[PDB]
């Protein structure tokens, strides 16, 4: 529809889907046919519609010539090609009329209602900065810039540190722990050892897990009643062995005047309240917690923490290796069953590290903000600092969002005018959790029968189901949050809700509905490869939260027996199924309230 | 490619089953052909109301969808279709719309919205003459 103007016109105005005139060119010629059949061609029974559509030309054919479904032949009747030339002119007042309801809406939000659009959000990145062997200390202030490359069709991306760290030579040589799994026997894991050059393996180690590098402490398999043999060396005097897993960090090439700054990359289910201890020359551990200023919230989230290494901390000490300085960390893991109640996951840990945020957010085009920036990208600063050896990012670019497009800006303000930042109804509780929290895949309401039986039930229980990106419990199909941040979603929604509304969010218990189906496949495929491949797409559609990087799609509690049977049929490798045998722990099974169905295939 | 067809061309065959043996009819493939159309969101039932016993159509081994018609016969699924079955609201086909409202239709109303075929005849292909020029 008039591609010469509508490129220029669509770029200025948002031009949404709705049009004031859905009048198509085929629809217009039927309107002009009923008009002309009234006008009398003079002194004759035939009318003017016989003139304008004369010889083998119907308005369906003239619309085909106009939209070029038919190639335009050289001979057309002149009063018809006069008529098709008019409809080419009338595309211009129509196209300026369709562009106006998109401009009426934007006038309403920005001029009268005063609403603004969100600007671009800068993203920060973990940045580890190692030094050379030539100096010990090097200071760099707030606002020094690191960079890698350039955005397409624009400027270079600069990253600046938010806080002025001072770098020192050194590294994390040793990371070891003691865990207390059983009475009178304790195991001694050594995942990270620089002196044997063994690294932190496999991108992440379960803290206090079965590493199989452990050796049992035979000095402590029977408790002492040798020079007082304890783990990791001889102790001077009696030291307690409490029921708390604790990990020890081995620091190297750091002087007691200097400070140390780590960035922990963590996914922890529940936060353990930690206390930190350091070695001394008397071989007694002292408290370090006055010196620690942590932003990792006692190892809850990823974050930087810098510690000035305390004075009179000793390199040479008993009960530990003598070459390295040591820091102790006592983990108080909260008591809970399952893999939810276990330790953090520890993607990694880097020394001499500090985060770095994006510098100028307006110049960078929208292509960079779409994806996180790739890992191991920034390898150099902007200004060449000669004593620096290398920077590196092991992980890259969490956070940061696009500047708002006019489609998504309209959806954002349409939400603010619907609920108005108060969660008063069932629908308003569903969206207000979904926009703020990124961990939420979906929320489903508590059903149809529940709200009508109601013998004065005050308590309402929203059942949240999260994505596979953010789940604390180690189950892919069954994602669970920890109850502390699950309670914090209720505390956010208690302010928006009525004071009489006691609202709290929970994870729903998962019903398992089994199916035992027989199915005949293609003539030239093995069925065991055919069973396994068909099972993956069936696992995907009815558990969309299970597969990583999925947009939240709204999906009901009910699974239909026949819509299941049709969904099996649209696989390219299927030919025909025989039976399904729906087996709830044969008809359609509908999910009872506060329950979510998971399919099982055995 | 084939023989001379005066009416239409048939480049794909319907792959008709042999009539030496009795023939199974598998209807598990039907549901997506039924799910295709715009207003249809799903189907709720697929069965027969004891009208197969006259020629002893047996359902094959385990599956509910397939039925095997005995040697000579061929399916006629709804004989004299709309006035006899579909319009009368006896329910050979029960439409459920908006939960339960369950509306129905008469015979002649769906024939106007029915696709009417066109009888087509294929004329022989020739090259017409050009203008004869006096080269002689």
TrEMBL record, chain A:
Superkingdom field: Bacteria
Protein name: Baseplate protein J-like domain-containing protein
Organism: Photorhabdus asymbiotica subsp. asymbiotica (strain ATCC 43949 / 3105-77)
From TrEMBL, chain B:
Organism of this sequence: Photorhabdus asymbiotica subsp. asymbiotica (strain ATCC 43949 / 3105-77) (Xenorhabdus luminescens (strain 2))
Protein name (database record): Uncharacterized protein
